[PDB]
């Protein structure tokens, strides 16, 4: 499918509301496995189970190991832009 740029607004006091799997050491993209009801990803729309996360805030996540991706994703604040695709 088409690569989408998706905006998520997160308050500083909360997480993103996503579960992810995958990463470089698994030979697959960072993938969204859950979108948690009533949390930012759910409320903001545009992000879906099965989407690969290609980048966040311009930071390339295509060749990133799982743990390092968790760090990068969890470190973002405020108005957070995701680059995602469903294949």
């Amino acid at each position: 499918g088409p690569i989408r740029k998706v905006l998520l607004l997160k308050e500083d006091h909360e997480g993103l509301g996503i579960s992810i799997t995958g990463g470089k050491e698994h030979g697959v993209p960072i993938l969204i496995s859950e979108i948690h009801p009533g949390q930012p990803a759910d409320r903001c729309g545009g992000l879906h189970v099965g989407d690969a996360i290609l980048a966040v805030n311009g930071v390339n996540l295509r060749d990133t190991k799982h743990k390092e991706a968790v760090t990068i994703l969890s470190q973002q604040r405020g108005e957070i832009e995701f680059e995602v695709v469903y294949v």
Partner: peptide
Amino acid sequence: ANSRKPTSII
């Protein structure tokens, strides 16, 4: 043994 795929919450 085979394992479930590592999953993280963020």
